[PDB]
């Protein structure tokens, strides 16, 4: 029995792939088991805009056209990240070879231009975008203050703590101009079963959604939270439940975006995969997708 068939009414079953998937023997297993795919590398910022104004969509287009041709859906990953993201977006070299943040006006223009050009280029070919990935520190000591809990990445240093909201606003504008496109906008993070981090993420989303909702008659700016699901055989499943119930109470949908269970035994994986799938089935009304990496 394919996972895809077992969870048909519950959630999409997904996989992360590359170009060499999609060929011959790998292609038939892909389709048999999965409804949705995410490109592992091909839609990241370094692959789509490697120098200023120079968008390179050929390889990504080829991949997405083939996935669509094959009857599967595509999840877009990722518009904004501090890894695999070219320096010119948010920094420059000063006179003495030191890399320094660009000003807020210039970096905000770059941020908005990258989000919007990418989202418009793919249009309705994706079912969802991870607009922002991994913006929160690990184990933040003060999750009551989400802005103080943000990782101080290059976007943060150029724009400040409101770059997350601005990124989602840039993406939301694209969807408002193109209401025929059915696309959910996600915020994505890992170690979501750390209760301080889940709390900081929940407070960030709630503050950003609330202010938006109050100005736009209850519409969400952030549609989804993605739990990456980089778990290990010692991952406590009650922690994953607390976090999931916490994200559900924001009225967002939830997805599991990069599920894998590594060592701290095959048996220990099975223990945890069953506890997780049990928990998902229980909350399937709120979970859109579960994707393995
Ligand atoms: Cl290319
Ligand atoms: Mg569901
Ligand atoms: Mg490309």
Curated annotation (Swiss-Prot):
Residues 1-293 form the GH10 domain. It comes from the Bacteria. It is found in: Secreted, Cell wall. The active site is at 134 (proton donor), 189, 258 (nucleophile). Belongs to the glycosyl hydrolase 10 (cellulase F) family. Catalyzes the depolymerization of methylglucuronoxylan (MeGAXn), a beta-1,4 xylan in which 10% to 20% of the xylose residues are substituted with alpha-1,2-4-O-methylglucuronate (MeGA) residues, which is predominant in hemicellulose fractions of hardwood and crop residues. Generates xylobiose (X2) and aldotetrauronate (MeGAX3) as the predominant products of MeGAXn hydrolysis; these products are then directly assimilated by the bacterium for subsequent metabolism. Thus, allows the bacterium to efficiently use polymeric MeGAXn as a growth substrate. This is Endo-1,4-beta-xylanase A. The gene is xynA1.
């Amino acid at each position: 029995a394919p996972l895809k068939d077992v969870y048909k009414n519950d959630f999409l079953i997904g996989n992360a792939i590359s170009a060499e998937d999609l060929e011959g023997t790998r292609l038939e297993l892909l389709k048999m088991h999965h409804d949705v795919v995410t490109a592992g590398n091909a839609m990241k910022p370094d692959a789509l805009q490697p120098t200023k104004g120079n968008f390179t969509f050929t390889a990504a287009d080829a991949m997405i056209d083939k996935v669509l041709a094959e009857g599967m859906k595509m999840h877009g990953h990722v518009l904004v990240w501090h890894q695999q993201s070219p320096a010119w977006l948010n920094t420059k070299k000063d006179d003495n070879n030191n890399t320094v943040p660009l000003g807020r006006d210039e970096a905000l223009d770059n941020l908005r231009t990258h989000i919007q050009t990418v989202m418009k280029h793919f249009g309705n070919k994706v079912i969802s975008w991870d607009v922002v990935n991994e913006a929160m520190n690990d184990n933040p000591s003060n999750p009551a203050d989400y802005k103080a809990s943000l990782r101080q990445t290059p976007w943060y240093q150029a724009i400040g703590s409101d770059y997350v909201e601005q990124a989602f606003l840039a993406a939301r504008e694209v969807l408002d101009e193109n209401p025929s496109w059915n696309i959910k906008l996600y915020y994505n993070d890992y170690n979501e079963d750390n209760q301080n981090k889940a709390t900081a993420i929940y407070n960030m989303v709630k503050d950003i959604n609330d202010r938006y909702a109050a100005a736009h008659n209850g519409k969400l700016l952030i549609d989804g939270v993605g739990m990456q699901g980089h778990y290990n055989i010692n991952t406590n499943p009650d922690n994953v439940k607390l976090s999931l119930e916490k994200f559900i109470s924001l009225g967002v949908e939830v997805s599991v975006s990069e599920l894998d269970v590594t060592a701290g035994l095959a048996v220990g994986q099975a223990y945890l995969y069953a506890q997780l799938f049990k928990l998902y089935k229980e909350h399937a009304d709120h979970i859109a997708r579960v994707t393995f990496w």
